[PDB]
Structures are given as C-alpha cells and as structure tokens.
Amino acid sequence: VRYSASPALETKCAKARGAYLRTHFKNSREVAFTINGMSLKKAFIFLDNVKEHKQAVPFRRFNGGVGRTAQGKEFGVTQARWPVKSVKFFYDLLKNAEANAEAKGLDMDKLIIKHVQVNAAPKQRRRTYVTAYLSSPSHIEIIVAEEEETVSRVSLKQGAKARNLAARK
Amino acid sequence: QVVTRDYTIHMHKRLYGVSFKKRAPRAIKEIVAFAQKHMQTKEVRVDPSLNKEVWKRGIRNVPHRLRLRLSRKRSDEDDKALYTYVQAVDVANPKMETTVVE
Amino acid sequence: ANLRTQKRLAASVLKCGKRKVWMDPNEISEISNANSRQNVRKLIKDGLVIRKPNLMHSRFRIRK
RNA sequence: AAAACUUUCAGCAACGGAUCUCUUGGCUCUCGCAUCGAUGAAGAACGCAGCGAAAUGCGAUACGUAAUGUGAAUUG
RNA sequence: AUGUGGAACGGGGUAUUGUAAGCAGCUGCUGAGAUUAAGCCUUUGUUCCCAAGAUUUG
RNA sequence: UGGACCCACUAAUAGGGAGCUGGGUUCCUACUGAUGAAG
RNA sequence: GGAAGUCGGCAAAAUGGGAAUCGAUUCCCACUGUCCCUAUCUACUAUCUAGCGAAACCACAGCCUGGGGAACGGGCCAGGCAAAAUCAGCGGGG
RNA sequence: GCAGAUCUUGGUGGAAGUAGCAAAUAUUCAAAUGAGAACUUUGAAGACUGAAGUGGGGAAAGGUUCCAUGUGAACAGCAGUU
RNA sequence: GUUUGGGUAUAGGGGCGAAAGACUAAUCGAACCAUCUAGUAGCUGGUUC
RNA sequence: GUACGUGAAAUUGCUGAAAGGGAAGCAUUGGAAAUCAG
C-alpha cells in the first residue's frame, strides 16, 4: 500500500505498518515526533529507557495539563511523559521494520527512521452513564532507510567589455 | 560474584512518620530497595518467612531493626543474570554489625 | 493452572468449607489433571488435598 | 536573532460518505376479472431439510406426496 | 571518575521516658532498660561501592 | 478603636468616590507565585 | 481570659442546671477556640505518574487610559505599551 | 439555484489528553500457567462481613446467566492468562 | 429505647383522597394512545442566480 | 483486498515553503521567491 511519503523504495528503505491500534492518537503522535530521524539502535535504547522511566517523551503539541519534569531538558522543553502503551506499539513496529530490512538485505548499521507518522483511526463508540467515551485509535507506519547524502547570457556590451578586460589581463 | 552477607536494617528510620495503613507494604518496598542498592541487582526475591516476620505484629507495627541475609545467588534462567534472595535471620539482639556469611 | 473447579469439588467430597480445603502447592500438575470427583477422592486418599481442622473459641479463658 | 508552537499555502496519507453513473424498488394513470368462511376462513402458535438462524414453502405424507407438461439436473 | 570519597551498620556523646525482662534477696543488679534521626553531633570501628552508561554542545 | 445615640479608651476616634446576612409590607485576560527555548 | 463574637451561647464543653416572670424570656453561678488570636496533629482530595477518558459553551477573539454624541465596546481615533512555550493557585472582569 | 429559519439528516471539531474514574478500612511474599501478571490459580501471612452476615435457602421477576472445553475480535471508565 | 405479599374491585373534568387542591405507570393547564389535523397565526423566525 | 465502484468538504497527521512582540481575516500599489505565457 502507498504511504504518505515518496520513499519506501527498494533502494534504501524498509516498511512497517500498524492499523486500528488501541493507543491514544495524541500520545502516539508525541512518540512518533520524538523518535523521527533517530537511528534504529538509538531509537531502541530510547524506547527501552522510556519504559524504564530513565528518559521521557516530550509532549510538544498536546501539552495541556502535562506536568513538568527534568527529563525533558534534553529536548529543550519542560513537559514530558512516559506513555508506555504507545512505546510498546512503536517498539513492535520498529522490530518489524528491522526484520523487513534484514529480509530485504540492507545494512543494519546505517538504518535510521526516515519517515514515521501517526494518523487517526475510525472512532470506537462506547457509552457513559448519557454521553460517549469515544476511543481514538491510531494508524502508524514506519519507513526506515540507511542514511545517505548558471547559464546566464551576455549582452553585446557586457561581453565586449569582458573580452577587453581579458585582453588587458 | 556469588556472595552472602548478614546485614542489619534500621527500619525505625526508613518509616519514620509513614502512615500506619502502609507500614508493612512500604516495609517490603524498603527491604527490596535496600537489597537493590547493596547487591547492585534488579531482581530481588523476598523469602515468605521474612514476609511473615515483617507482618507478625500487624500492618501498623514493624520492628525497628531487622537482621537480613542477602545472598547474591545466580539466576536459574540466565547464567549471566544474577539476583538477590533475602531471607530473615533469627537473632537474639538485632543490634549487631554486618558480617559475611560463608 | 486454574483450580476453581477442583477446589469446589474438593469441598463437596470433604463436606467442609472451601476455606478449610487445603490443596498442595507443589503438585499443581497432578491436581489439575484430577478433574472428576473420583479423581478428587483419589487425591484425598493419597493426601494431596487435606481438610484443615477447625479452630477454637477458647472456652479456657471463657471459664476463667 | 535559530528550533518548538500557531497560522497560511501545496503534495501525500488519513477521517468521512457527498457527487457521478446505475436500479428485480416505489409512485401515478389506464385496461381486464369477481374468487373467503362451520366441507373450518383471515389471523396466531409449534414444528418440518444431511449440514438452517432469518426469509420463503410446507404440515408427522412437513423447504412436501399424487397427477400433467418439460426433458438431465441440484449446487456451498 | 580512588578520595582528609561516599554509603550501610556499630560504638560514644547528647536527648525522651522513668528504674525494664531476667537473676534474684520493696530492695540490689538498676538514674536502669527501650528509643535516639528519620531535617542531632562525632568516628584510626567493620563491611561495602565508585577511575560508568546515555543525551546536547564551535 | 473596644462595648450595650449612649460609656469608656485614645494623640484622634474627620468626611466621601470607585464576598455575606438580617429585620421590614400580608474558556480567555487579569492578580499571585513557578519554570522556560533563544541571539 | 471566658460569649468581650454574632441580630443570638449557631456549634462544641460543663452532665447541660439553679432561681424567678409569661415551652419562651431574664437573672446569678458553671463550661468552653464563638472571640482576643490563631497555632499544631491525622485521614481524604487537590499535585505528579501508568491506563482510560468526557460535557457545557463556541461569529471571531482576547491588556489598560481618554474619546468615540448613544450603548460605551473588543474591533474605530489618540496614547501607554508589546517577545516563544508553559505549570500550579485564586476568581476580579462576561 | 441557499449562509442563516434556537432549520432537518449525517459527519466532524476547539475546549482536551482537560474535568474526572469508586463509596463499603487492606493488602503482602513465593511458586505455576502464560508472549505478556498489582488484578488468573495454589500455599503462607495480614484483614473484613461477625448468625439482625460479604452465610445457606426460597416466592415474585429474569430465561440458560447453570457446568465443562476453547477464545481474548467487541463488552468488564485500569488491566487480564480471568 | 400498625407494616406488608398475593388475589380482587373502583377509569378520566371519571375514580380515589384524615382534603395538601393532592394520587391515578419519571405526564395531571386538566392520564396516555390514534384519527379529525396539514386545526385556528392580527404574531415570531427564514424565504435560494 | 470485503472496514471493497467513483471517494468531495468539514477535521487530522507527515513533508516542503513562508510569516509571527496583545488578534487573525480582506482590499490597493509594488518588491522578493516560485511558476506560466507570448
């Protein structure tokens, strides 16, 4: 299936997708935004550390009521949290993405998360005693790829002066 | 690596002022944290006998000082992972100094 | 595994309360396999499941 | 005075089910016919298939039998 | 990140209560015993642990 | 100012502008503290 | 110290009670954090965290001063001013 | 031929990961199953209802909720191997 | 320090009520249901290039 | 790819470009970048 981005080509990329996951869309976006651009091994260390409460996921956009912490000072913000369910899902997709990369035959050392994205899923209706306790599932996909990095004219006056200057030189 | 030591814990100072309904559970939490910070481990298993010793006087009363036997035994699931096993020691006067058990 | 039904049957055959039913902790496999009342009575005879005795109201201090 | 955040624009991906096309349905008009029941009606109930819950059909001869016509199926 | 290093206990001082259990013969041990830092002081005491992992920086 | 116009204290008990109760009729913004990226 | 608070012993303490007048009122005694005058202690909530997760309301929004004939208002006029992102309070402004 | 009708039907937002989660004192240790255990099972310990029960039975009412096996899609404002 | 289970009777400007102008299936400006009804509009709000 | 014809808007995520000191929107003129055309 086509993704949000031009990459996922066979040249450098590996794909992973998870749809209709019982994870909060706001927390999923925070984890995706944090881990985007990281190396694959660095992302694994980060997610393990978030699980163990040693580093935290900064809550940039959906930061209403989020408490402050010292662990967010490595990203230049004060509001950070430790969403464990989103980390579990992202870790599973990252493991699947690495496995697909090994199957494709890529170099595991240079792999970085080129494109990670979270989208909202069809909301799930549940009742509250009346109102609704709507769930907000997430569509998450991951693209990991190994890192890789004047015809001006001249007027008659302009060129004639330039030629004269060259003759003087 | 595999060692065994007899420590004494000052429980009087580790739950000074704590709520009476949480004395015994926080006692277990302090014991496992005490074992972790001593043997430099992660998995710490509490002997049911020591749990009995903690809860003998009720959830609201814990002895001021307890004699523990911390053994940094090798785990039975991974031979490179190691854990601590904490069992109580029955001594007459708990105010004795830490020693090393053969 | 799960031993709700085994405990219920054990209380039924012992004619006591399931609070007093004592089920051996290090023979879980054999106890779990024992599923019918005939097997439960077999466990009773072998001593794997024992009926805990009653407690007391201590008439001793009541008389005192 | 860079990021993040907010907003605007564009590509892609989502959410949602509009639009376009269709349609064994509906609506309207016209024409033709006169046929329920104590010989048990309309209706209701309960059942019936090799594997059926509903719909349809049927009634212990039960997703039917007899008779007539067709002529080689039924179908998951 | 090997130091007048830290930590866990132990001793002492200082405090709170009031003279413990036991041994005994109210009395003696016995101003004893118990507690003492959890936001008290001290330590030639013992034991233990650290010259590590990650992140951002012209 | 303290008490039931009254009587004390007091140096004095001066006059006015811009949360509450009794007897009487039958979100955001402000304020206050707390962080915080950045030449 | 002992109702000095309040329209007033509302509520607690005395264990509620003694005498008068018509259950009420008054008086004297008695008691007390109502008060001078607040301080301390405990539990829960609030705080943070993991999970779950709404609703009211919603033209757009959001600083003040003087003026805008009025209705002065947040948009207009003239000024003071004006630097991201936020957290916990209190509720002035609807 | 729609911008309104506190219009109809459907869908979606900001508030917002915010308000908040239930009364009914209270859980802890080990082991087993299991991908996964604060919540499942057993043992041990600590508690509670305290015969006017968190006990055992029935009438009305419900109708297969009963029991075994299996599942963990959806439901059990957390979770779940239940 | 009479209450109540079941059976039955009373039905709508009716019944019932130690009387509150109360109850009569979360409704008593006058029970609920369906038709007359697409009721009555001096009035309000909208009425499309 | 059955959550299945076509698949709009509101709304959301990512990428790229740009702006931002208590509003934002819009209009007029022109610069800057991008793009098309004679």
PDB file of N, CA, C and O (backbone and C1' of nucleotides) in Angstrom, chain I residues 8-44:
ATOM      1  P     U I   8     -56.562 -11.206  40.047  1.00  0.00           P
ATOM      2  O5'   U I   8     -57.792 -10.429  40.693  1.00  0.00           O
ATOM      3  C5'   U I   8     -59.043 -11.077  40.866  1.00  0.00           C
ATOM      4  C4'   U I   8     -59.990 -10.255  41.702  1.00  0.00           C
ATOM      5  C3'   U I   8     -60.317  -8.864  41.185  1.00  0.00           C
ATOM      6  O3'   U I   8     -61.278  -8.870  40.144  1.00  0.00           O
ATOM      7  C1'   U I   8     -59.865  -8.762  43.502  1.00  0.00           C
ATOM      8  P     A I   9     -61.351  -7.645  39.107  1.00  0.00           P
ATOM      9  O5'   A I   9     -62.053  -6.480  39.935  1.00  0.00           O
ATOM     10  C5'   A I   9     -63.372  -6.639  40.433  1.00  0.00           C
ATOM     11  C4'   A I   9     -63.780  -5.484  41.310  1.00  0.00           C
ATOM     12  C3'   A I   9     -63.589  -4.098  40.721  1.00  0.00           C
ATOM     13  O3'   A I   9     -64.615  -3.740  39.814  1.00  0.00           O
ATOM     14  C1'   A I   9     -62.797  -4.129  42.948  1.00  0.00           C
ATOM     15  P     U I  10     -64.285  -2.797  38.556  1.00  0.00           P
ATOM     16  O5'   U I  10     -64.204  -1.339  39.191  1.00  0.00           O
ATOM     17  C5'   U I  10     -65.277  -0.825  39.963  1.00  0.00           C
ATOM     18  C4'   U I  10     -64.913   0.486  40.610  1.00  0.00           C
ATOM     19  C3'   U I  10     -64.238   1.502  39.708  1.00  0.00           C
ATOM     20  O3'   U I  10     -65.159   2.200  38.890  1.00  0.00           O
ATOM     21  C1'   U I  10     -63.086   1.380  41.771  1.00  0.00           C
ATOM     22  P     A I  11     -65.078   2.063  37.292  1.00  0.00           P
ATOM     23  O5'   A I  11     -63.780   2.900  36.910  1.00  0.00           O
ATOM     24  C5'   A I  11     -63.631   4.244  37.353  1.00  0.00           C
ATOM     25  C4'   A I  11     -63.029   5.122  36.286  1.00  0.00           C
ATOM     26  C3'   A I  11     -63.496   4.831  34.860  1.00  0.00           C
ATOM     27  O3'   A I  11     -63.579   6.053  34.130  1.00  0.00           O
ATOM     28  C1'   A I  11     -61.149   4.606  34.986  1.00  0.00           C
ATOM     29  P     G I  12     -64.830   6.329  33.160  1.00  0.00           P
ATOM     30  O5'   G I  12     -64.577   7.809  32.628  1.00  0.00           O
ATOM     31  C5'   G I  12     -63.283   8.214  32.193  1.00  0.00           C
ATOM     32  C4'   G I  12     -62.981   9.637  32.593  1.00  0.00           C
ATOM     33  C3'   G I  12     -62.506  10.544  31.462  1.00  0.00           C
ATOM     34  O3'   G I  12     -62.965  11.874  31.700  1.00  0.00           O
ATOM     35  C1'   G I  12     -60.838  10.429  33.128  1.00  0.00           C
ATOM     36  P     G I  13     -64.303  12.410  30.986  1.00  0.00           P
ATOM     37  O5'   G I  13     -64.822  13.559  31.960  1.00  0.00           O
ATOM     38  C5'   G I  13     -64.106  14.783  32.082  1.00  0.00           C
ATOM     39  C4'   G I  13     -63.837  15.142  33.523  1.00  0.00           C
ATOM     40  C3'   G I  13     -65.022  15.735  34.281  1.00  0.00           C
ATOM     41  O3'   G I  13     -64.924  15.376  35.659  1.00  0.00           O
ATOM     42  C1'   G I  13     -63.268  17.315  34.204  1.00  0.00           C
ATOM     43  P     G I  14     -66.207  14.821  36.449  1.00  0.00           P
ATOM     44  O5'   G I  14     -66.259  13.276  36.068  1.00  0.00           O
ATOM     45  C5'   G I  14     -66.767  12.318  36.984  1.00  0.00           C
ATOM     46  C4'   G I  14     -66.298  10.925  36.649  1.00  0.00           C
ATOM     47  C3'   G I  14     -65.753  10.113  37.814  1.00  0.00           C
ATOM     48  O3'   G I  14     -66.771   9.512  38.593  1.00  0.00           O
ATOM     49  C1'   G I  14     -64.266   9.956  35.987  1.00  0.00           C
ATOM     50  P     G I  15     -66.726   9.612  40.195  1.00  0.00           P
ATOM     51  O5'   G I  15     -65.564   8.606  40.612  1.00  0.00           O
ATOM     52  C5'   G I  15     -65.639   7.226  40.280  1.00  0.00           C
ATOM     53  C4'   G I  15     -64.314   6.537  40.487  1.00  0.00           C
ATOM     54  C3'   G I  15     -63.692   6.693  41.867  1.00  0.00           C
ATOM     55  O3'   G I  15     -64.225   5.780  42.810  1.00  0.00           O
ATOM     56  C1'   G I  15     -62.056   7.104  40.203  1.00  0.00           C
ATOM     57  P     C I  16     -64.564   6.259  44.306  1.00  0.00           P
ATOM     58  O5'   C I  16     -63.138   6.547  44.955  1.00  0.00           O
ATOM     59  C5'   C I  16     -62.199   5.502  45.156  1.00  0.00           C
ATOM     60  C4'   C I  16     -60.819   6.048  45.423  1.00  0.00           C
ATOM     61  C3'   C I  16     -60.704   7.020  46.587  1.00  0.00           C
ATOM     62  O3'   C I  16     -60.609   6.371  47.843  1.00  0.00           O
ATOM     63  C1'   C I  16     -59.595   7.914  44.703  1.00  0.00           C
ATOM     64  P     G I  17     -61.433   6.926  49.106  1.00  0.00           P
ATOM     65  O5'   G I  17     -60.551   8.140  49.644  1.00  0.00           O
ATOM     66  C5'   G I  17     -59.274   7.911  50.222  1.00  0.00           C
ATOM     67  C4'   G I  17     -58.413   9.148  50.177  1.00  0.00           C
ATOM     68  C3'   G I  17     -58.915  10.338  50.979  1.00  0.00           C
ATOM     69  O3'   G I  17     -58.581  10.256  52.354  1.00  0.00           O
ATOM     70  C1'   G I  17     -58.313  11.052  48.813  1.00  0.00           C
ATOM     71  P     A I  18     -59.720   9.964  53.450  1.00  0.00           P
ATOM     72  O5'   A I  18     -59.277  10.834  54.708  1.00  0.00           O
ATOM     73  C5'   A I  18     -59.667  12.195  54.826  1.00  0.00           C
ATOM     74  C4'   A I  18     -58.876  12.914  55.890  1.00  0.00           C
ATOM     75  C3'   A I  18     -57.378  13.021  55.654  1.00  0.00           C
ATOM     76  O3'   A I  18     -57.039  14.072  54.766  1.00  0.00           O
ATOM     77  C1'   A I  18     -57.783  12.342  57.883  1.00  0.00           C
ATOM     78  P     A I  19     -55.686  14.003  53.900  1.00  0.00           P
ATOM     79  O5'   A I  19     -55.669  15.391  53.120  1.00  0.00           O
ATOM     80  C5'   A I  19     -56.000  16.602  53.792  1.00  0.00           C
ATOM     81  C4'   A I  19     -56.576  17.629  52.848  1.00  0.00           C
ATOM     82  C3'   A I  19     -57.479  18.671  53.503  1.00  0.00           C
ATOM     83  O3'   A I  19     -57.346  19.915  52.818  1.00  0.00           O
ATOM     84  C1'   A I  19     -58.712  17.458  51.891  1.00  0.00           C
ATOM     85  P     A I  20     -56.275  21.000  53.325  1.00  0.00           P
ATOM     86  O5'   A I  20     -54.947  20.628  52.525  1.00  0.00           O
ATOM     87  C5'   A I  20     -53.759  21.390  52.685  1.00  0.00           C
ATOM     88  C4'   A I  20     -52.716  20.998  51.669  1.00  0.00           C
ATOM     89  C3'   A I  20     -53.115  21.142  50.209  1.00  0.00           C
ATOM     90  O3'   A I  20     -52.974  22.471  49.730  1.00  0.00           O
ATOM     91  C1'   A I  20     -52.055  19.044  50.560  1.00  0.00           C
ATOM     92  P     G I  21     -54.241  23.461  49.660  1.00  0.00           P
ATOM     93  O5'   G I  21     -54.696  23.410  48.136  1.00  0.00           O
ATOM     94  C5'   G I  21     -53.748  23.251  47.085  1.00  0.00           C
ATOM     95  C4'   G I  21     -53.996  21.976  46.321  1.00  0.00           C
ATOM     96  C3'   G I  21     -54.019  22.116  44.802  1.00  0.00           C
ATOM     97  O3'   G I  21     -53.499  20.926  44.210  1.00  0.00           O
ATOM     98  C1'   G I  21     -56.114  21.311  45.556  1.00  0.00           C
ATOM     99  P     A I  22     -51.915  20.760  43.995  1.00  0.00           P
ATOM    100  O5'   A I  22     -51.532  19.511  44.907  1.00  0.00           O
ATOM    101  C5'   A I  22     -51.424  18.212  44.347  1.00  0.00           C
ATOM    102  C4'   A I  22     -51.536  17.137  45.399  1.00  0.00           C
ATOM    103  C3'   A I  22     -51.585  15.711  44.875  1.00  0.00           C
ATOM    104  O3'   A I  22     -50.298  15.190  44.597  1.00  0.00           O
ATOM    105  C1'   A I  22     -53.305  16.028  46.468  1.00  0.00           C
ATOM    106  P     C I  23     -49.836  14.932  43.080  1.00  0.00           P
ATOM    107  O5'   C I  23     -50.157  13.391  42.839  1.00  0.00           O
ATOM    108  C5'   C I  23     -49.494  12.386  43.590  1.00  0.00           C
ATOM    109  C4'   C I  23     -50.254  11.085  43.567  1.00  0.00           C
ATOM    110  C3'   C I  23     -50.635  10.560  42.193  1.00  0.00           C
ATOM    111  O3'   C I  23     -49.571   9.882  41.547  1.00  0.00           O
ATOM    112  C1'   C I  23     -52.509  10.444  43.627  1.00  0.00           C
ATOM    113  P     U I  24     -49.412   9.957  39.949  1.00  0.00           P
ATOM    114  O5'   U I  24     -50.630   9.092  39.400  1.00  0.00           O
ATOM    115  C5'   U I  24     -50.736   7.707  39.696  1.00  0.00           C
ATOM    116  C4'   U I  24     -52.073   7.156  39.272  1.00  0.00           C
ATOM    117  C3'   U I  24     -52.435   7.354  37.809  1.00  0.00           C
ATOM    118  O3'   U I  24     -51.846   6.382  36.963  1.00  0.00           O
ATOM    119  C1'   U I  24     -54.263   7.989  39.161  1.00  0.00           C
ATOM    120  P     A I  25     -51.182   6.820  35.569  1.00  0.00           P
ATOM    121  O5'   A I  25     -49.741   6.145  35.601  1.00  0.00           O
ATOM    122  C5'   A I  25     -48.747   6.580  36.524  1.00  0.00           C
ATOM    123  C4'   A I  25     -47.397   5.978  36.217  1.00  0.00           C
ATOM    124  C3'   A I  25     -46.890   6.204  34.795  1.00  0.00           C
ATOM    125  O3'   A I  25     -45.468   6.329  34.808  1.00  0.00           O
ATOM    126  C1'   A I  25     -47.122   3.881  35.195  1.00  0.00           C
ATOM    127  P     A I  26     -44.785   7.718  34.374  1.00  0.00           P
ATOM    128  O5'   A I  26     -43.509   7.845  35.316  1.00  0.00           O
ATOM    129  C5'   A I  26     -43.616   8.442  36.604  1.00  0.00           C
ATOM    130  C4'   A I  26     -42.580   9.519  36.820  1.00  0.00           C
ATOM    131  C3'   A I  26     -42.499  10.590  35.731  1.00  0.00           C
ATOM    132  O3'   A I  26     -42.205  11.854  36.324  1.00  0.00           O
ATOM    133  C1'   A I  26     -40.399   9.518  35.954  1.00  0.00           C
ATOM    134  P     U I  27     -43.366  12.948  36.508  1.00  0.00           P
ATOM    135  O5'   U I  27     -44.208  12.854  35.158  1.00  0.00           O
ATOM    136  C5'   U I  27     -43.959  13.746  34.081  1.00  0.00           C
ATOM    137  C4'   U I  27     -45.245  14.286  33.507  1.00  0.00           C
ATOM    138  C3'   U I  27     -46.461  14.189  34.418  1.00  0.00           C
ATOM    139  O3'   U I  27     -46.533  15.265  35.340  1.00  0.00           O
ATOM    140  C1'   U I  27     -47.017  13.387  32.258  1.00  0.00           C
ATOM    141  P     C I  28     -47.441  15.154  36.661  1.00  0.00           P
ATOM    142  O5'   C I  28     -48.877  15.662  36.191  1.00  0.00           O
ATOM    143  C5'   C I  28     -49.048  16.955  35.619  1.00  0.00           C
ATOM    144  C4'   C I  28     -50.507  17.301  35.447  1.00  0.00           C
ATOM    145  C3'   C I  28     -51.230  17.726  36.725  1.00  0.00           C
ATOM    146  O3'   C I  28     -52.258  18.661  36.398  1.00  0.00           O
ATOM    147  C1'   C I  28     -52.248  15.782  35.858  1.00  0.00           C
ATOM    148  P     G I  29     -51.971  20.244  36.415  1.00  0.00           P
ATOM    149  O5'   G I  29     -53.217  20.862  35.636  1.00  0.00           O
ATOM    150  C5'   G I  29     -53.173  22.178  35.096  1.00  0.00           C
ATOM    151  C4'   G I  29     -53.327  22.159  33.594  1.00  0.00           C
ATOM    152  C3'   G I  29     -52.038  21.927  32.806  1.00  0.00           C
ATOM    153  O3'   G I  29     -52.331  21.152  31.645  1.00  0.00           O
ATOM    154  C1'   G I  29     -53.011  23.972  32.142  1.00  0.00           C
ATOM    155  P     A I  30     -51.821  19.632  31.539  1.00  0.00           P
ATOM    156  O5'   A I  30     -53.135  18.766  31.788  1.00  0.00           O
ATOM    157  C5'   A I  30     -53.296  18.016  32.983  1.00  0.00           C
ATOM    158  C4'   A I  30     -54.738  17.972  33.425  1.00  0.00           C
ATOM    159  C3'   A I  30     -55.741  17.471  32.398  1.00  0.00           C
ATOM    160  O3'   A I  30     -55.784  16.059  32.311  1.00  0.00           O
ATOM    161  C1'   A I  30     -56.562  19.442  33.407  1.00  0.00           C
ATOM    162  P     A I  31     -55.538  15.326  30.903  1.00  0.00           P
ATOM    163  O5'   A I  31     -54.749  14.002  31.301  1.00  0.00           O
ATOM    164  C5'   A I  31     -53.637  14.057  32.180  1.00  0.00           C
ATOM    165  C4'   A I  31     -52.988  12.705  32.321  1.00  0.00           C
ATOM    166  C3'   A I  31     -52.581  12.034  31.020  1.00  0.00           C
ATOM    167  O3'   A I  31     -51.332  12.498  30.539  1.00  0.00           O
ATOM    168  C1'   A I  31     -53.751  10.489  32.372  1.00  0.00           C
ATOM    169  P     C I  32     -51.179  13.017  29.027  1.00  0.00           P
ATOM    170  O5'   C I  32     -50.826  11.699  28.209  1.00  0.00           O
ATOM    171  C5'   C I  32     -49.770  10.847  28.627  1.00  0.00           C
ATOM    172  C4'   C I  32     -49.983   9.437  28.142  1.00  0.00           C
ATOM    173  C3'   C I  32     -50.299   9.291  26.664  1.00  0.00           C
ATOM    174  O3'   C I  32     -49.143   9.335  25.845  1.00  0.00           O
ATOM    175  C1'   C I  32     -51.827   8.006  27.921  1.00  0.00           C
ATOM    176  P     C I  33     -49.213  10.010  24.391  1.00  0.00           P
ATOM    177  O5'   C I  33     -49.994   8.938  23.511  1.00  0.00           O
ATOM    178  C5'   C I  33     -49.500   7.615  23.376  1.00  0.00           C
ATOM    179  C4'   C I  33     -50.475   6.734  22.641  1.00  0.00           C
ATOM    180  C3'   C I  33     -51.017   7.287  21.338  1.00  0.00           C
ATOM    181  O3'   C I  33     -50.110   7.143  20.262  1.00  0.00           O
ATOM    182  C1'   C I  33     -52.791   6.386  22.611  1.00  0.00           C
ATOM    183  P     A I  34     -49.814   8.390  19.293  1.00  0.00           P
ATOM    184  O5'   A I  34     -50.861   8.198  18.111  1.00  0.00           O
ATOM    185  C5'   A I  34     -50.948   6.962  17.421  1.00  0.00           C
ATOM    186  C4'   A I  34     -52.288   6.796  16.754  1.00  0.00           C
ATOM    187  C3'   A I  34     -52.799   7.997  15.981  1.00  0.00           C
ATOM    188  O3'   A I  34     -52.206   8.115  14.700  1.00  0.00           O
ATOM    189  C1'   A I  34     -54.536   7.124  17.322  1.00  0.00           C
ATOM    190  P     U I  35     -52.586   9.342  13.739  1.00  0.00           P
ATOM    191  O5'   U I  35     -53.891   8.837  12.979  1.00  0.00           O
ATOM    192  C5'   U I  35     -54.542   9.666  12.033  1.00  0.00           C
ATOM    193  C4'   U I  35     -56.040   9.618  12.193  1.00  0.00           C
ATOM    194  C3'   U I  35     -56.760  10.935  11.967  1.00  0.00           C
ATOM    195  O3'   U I  35     -56.964  11.218  10.594  1.00  0.00           O
ATOM    196  C1'   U I  35     -57.558   9.932  13.953  1.00  0.00           C
ATOM    197  P     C I  36     -56.440  12.603   9.979  1.00  0.00           P
ATOM    198  O5'   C I  36     -57.648  13.608  10.236  1.00  0.00           O
ATOM    199  C5'   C I  36     -58.964  13.274   9.821  1.00  0.00           C
ATOM    200  C4'   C I  36     -60.005  14.043  10.594  1.00  0.00           C
ATOM    201  C3'   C I  36     -59.810  15.547  10.667  1.00  0.00           C
ATOM    202  O3'   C I  36     -60.245  16.210   9.493  1.00  0.00           O
ATOM    203  C1'   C I  36     -60.371  14.705  12.810  1.00  0.00           C
ATOM    204  P     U I  37     -59.545  17.581   9.032  1.00  0.00           P
ATOM    205  O5'   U I  37     -58.084  17.497   9.657  1.00  0.00           O
ATOM    206  C5'   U I  37     -56.979  17.036   8.886  1.00  0.00           C
ATOM    207  C4'   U I  37     -55.670  17.357   9.560  1.00  0.00           C
ATOM    208  C3'   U I  37     -54.963  16.170  10.210  1.00  0.00           C
ATOM    209  O3'   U I  37     -53.554  16.380  10.160  1.00  0.00           O
ATOM    210  C1'   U I  37     -55.485  17.769  11.863  1.00  0.00           C
ATOM    211  P     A I  38     -52.640  15.545   9.136  1.00  0.00           P
ATOM    212  O5'   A I  38     -51.517  16.584   8.693  1.00  0.00           O
ATOM    213  C5'   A I  38     -50.891  17.436   9.648  1.00  0.00           C
ATOM    214  C4'   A I  38     -51.056  18.894   9.290  1.00  0.00           C
ATOM    215  C3'   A I  38     -52.486  19.422   9.363  1.00  0.00           C
ATOM    216  O3'   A I  38     -52.470  20.799   9.741  1.00  0.00           O
ATOM    217  C1'   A I  38     -51.684  19.620   7.147  1.00  0.00           C
ATOM    218  P     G I  39     -52.574  21.228  11.288  1.00  0.00           P
ATOM    219  O5'   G I  39     -54.118  21.055  11.643  1.00  0.00           O
ATOM    220  C5'   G I  39     -55.126  21.354  10.689  1.00  0.00           C
ATOM    221  C4'   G I  39     -56.201  22.237  11.268  1.00  0.00           C
ATOM    222  C3'   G I  39     -55.812  23.684  11.516  1.00  0.00           C
ATOM    223  O3'   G I  39     -55.849  24.473  10.341  1.00  0.00           O
ATOM    224  C1'   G I  39     -56.939  22.838  13.409  1.00  0.00           C
ATOM    225  P     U I  40     -54.821  25.694  10.157  1.00  0.00           P
ATOM    226  O5'   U I  40     -55.454  26.863  11.036  1.00  0.00           O
ATOM    227  C5'   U I  40     -56.776  27.322  10.793  1.00  0.00           C
ATOM    228  C4'   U I  40     -57.316  28.098  11.967  1.00  0.00           C
ATOM    229  C3'   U I  40     -56.486  29.289  12.416  1.00  0.00           C
ATOM    230  O3'   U I  40     -56.700  30.442  11.622  1.00  0.00           O
ATOM    231  C1'   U I  40     -57.100  28.004  14.299  1.00  0.00           C
ATOM    232  P     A I  41     -55.450  31.296  11.084  1.00  0.00           P
ATOM    233  O5'   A I  41     -55.414  32.571  12.038  1.00  0.00           O
ATOM    234  C5'   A I  41     -54.815  32.500  13.328  1.00  0.00           C
ATOM    235  C4'   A I  41     -53.629  33.424  13.434  1.00  0.00           C
ATOM    236  C3'   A I  41     -53.051  33.877  12.094  1.00  0.00           C
ATOM    237  O3'   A I  41     -52.537  35.203  12.215  1.00  0.00           O
ATOM    238  C1'   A I  41     -51.402  32.693  13.304  1.00  0.00           C
ATOM    239  P     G I  42     -53.252  36.410  11.434  1.00  0.00           P
ATOM    240  O5'   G I  42     -52.272  37.647  11.650  1.00  0.00           O
ATOM    241  C5'   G I  42     -52.446  38.846  10.907  1.00  0.00           C
ATOM    242  C4'   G I  42     -52.802  40.002  11.807  1.00  0.00           C
ATOM    243  C3'   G I  42     -51.743  40.403  12.822  1.00  0.00           C
ATOM    244  O3'   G I  42     -50.739  41.241  12.274  1.00  0.00           O
ATOM    245  C1'   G I  42     -53.830  40.215  13.906  1.00  0.00           C
ATOM    246  P     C I  43     -49.256  40.672  12.025  1.00  0.00           P
ATOM    247  O5'   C I  43     -48.938  39.823  13.334  1.00  0.00           O
ATOM    248  C5'   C I  43     -48.655  40.460  14.572  1.00  0.00           C
ATOM    249  C4'   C I  43     -47.809  39.583  15.456  1.00  0.00           C
ATOM    250  C3'   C I  43     -46.479  39.139  14.867  1.00  0.00           C
ATOM    251  O3'   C I  43     -45.465  40.123  14.963  1.00  0.00           O
ATOM    252  C1'   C I  43     -47.580  37.268  15.775  1.00  0.00           C
ATOM    253  P     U I  44     -44.274  40.152  13.885  1.00  0.00           P
ATOM    254  O5'   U I  44     -43.297  38.985  14.361  1.00  0.00           O
ATOM    255  C5'   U I  44     -42.745  38.993  15.668  1.00  0.00           C
ATOM    256  C4'   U I  44     -42.035  37.702  15.989  1.00  0.00           C
ATOM    257  C3'   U I  44     -40.957  37.264  15.014  1.00  0.00           C
ATOM    258  O3'   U I  44     -39.739  37.968  15.178  1.00  0.00           O
ATOM    259  C1'   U I  44     -42.308  35.412  15.582  1.00  0.00           C
TER     260        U I  44
END
